[PDB]
Amino acid sequence: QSGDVLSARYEIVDTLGEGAFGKVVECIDHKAGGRHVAVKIVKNVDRYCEAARSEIQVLEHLNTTDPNSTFRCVQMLEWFEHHGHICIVFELLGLSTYDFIKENGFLPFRLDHIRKMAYQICKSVNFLHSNKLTHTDLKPENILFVQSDYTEAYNPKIKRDERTLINPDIKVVDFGSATYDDEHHSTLVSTRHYRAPEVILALGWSQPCDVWSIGCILIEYYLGFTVFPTHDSKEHLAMMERILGPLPKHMIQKTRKRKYFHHDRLDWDEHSSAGRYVSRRCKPLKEFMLSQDVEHERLFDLIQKMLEYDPAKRITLREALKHPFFDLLK
Structure with a gap:
């Protein structure tokens, strides 16, 4: 999937890791000077979708209580959907x-x-x-x-x-x-x-x-x-x-x-x-x-x-x- 472009800014350049859930990829952020982020791309499969939404709710709670980590x-930067995959953007x-x-x-x-x-x-x-x-x-x-x-x-x-x-x-x-x-x-x-x-x-x-x-x-x-x-x-x-x-x-x-x-x-x-x-x-x-x-x-x-x-x-x-x-x- 290297070369794919998520949310019109994140270009996949490498696979950091892989799991039941899907994968984590390294992307270039074309809208922030080319600097690099991690993106978890979750399979388009109910049990993995539900776990990603659960993870986002936990990270919104943790990231609000402790914004400086x-x-x-791990700091969640944002999340979105991409071809029915939940994508969570993290600090690299x-x-x-x-x-x-x-x-x-x-x-x-x-x-x-x-x-x-x-x-x-x-x-x-x-x-x-x-x-x-x-x-x-x-x-x-x-x-x-x-x-x-x-x-x-x-x-x-x-x-x-x-x-x-x-x-x-x-x-x-x-x-x-x-x-x-x-x-x-x-x-x-x-x-x-x-x-x-x-x-x-x-x-x-x-x-x-x-x-x-x-x-x-x-x-x-x-x-x-x-x-x-x-x-x-x-x-x-x-x-x-x-x-x-x-x-x-x-x-x-x-x-x-x-x-x-x-x-x-x-x-x-x-x-x-x-x-x-x-x-x-x-x-x-x-x-x-x-x-x-x-x-x-x-x-x-x-x-x-x-x-x-x-x-x-x-x-x-x-x-x-x-x-x-x-x-x-x-």
Whole structure:
């Protein structure tokens, strides 16, 4: 679709990204001196239309309450329709955190960068939580750098060239799943590797499912890989039990997902091929730590609080933002 011209001013010059919903494109703005914007072009399909209108209503609310994006939600510039596609015009951001890690060889972020990015993610999502909103789809693809300009130094430790961001500031994108407290809550939310246990067990969810997602994002930034390399619900739960310990009995008793359980325990054979896979790939959370220094211990203390099984006990982002992991920032 490159060369197409939206609303008689936006010329598509590149695809930034692609999704169930449609795509995000980079356009030249012929009416603002040629400067570049992002345009989300949503498929001409009811469910994607409804989610785009929902996203526009959330962005009008967020952009009105916080017009300078103090809380780091992407800025919507305008919206329109084009051949029955809803088009949302955004400030042009740089790469996703995912694309950055990928283009760098799945080398993790330095702890100092993770500290800054985690703070900003927590500050951004807490702003939603303060406005009776839950994002529901937090993942590294939905966390974008403001500018993804980097320097390169040879790193003798790894014997190769690595990229360090000049500025690691981020914004949160994709409000098409965002849900107000008083609205219908989808049965299934989140991308699987970031999905909270109350979602897998169909117990109901609210703001704390976002906190679980953030805890999984921080592990990936720290390791460069997920600790949940799965595409199966029961196996995902077996992996949580290996990393975090047994599920709470009250959550097992409450679930109607009876296929995952035998008696009141996960129906999981550690001696099966899948069982060996989970035993090989997954291990107690603190075993993933690359260093024993206090900075590392405090990140893992935060992570473990975010990956509390019981969403009623899980750390809130208001409590996260005061975690000692974040002092070296103030």
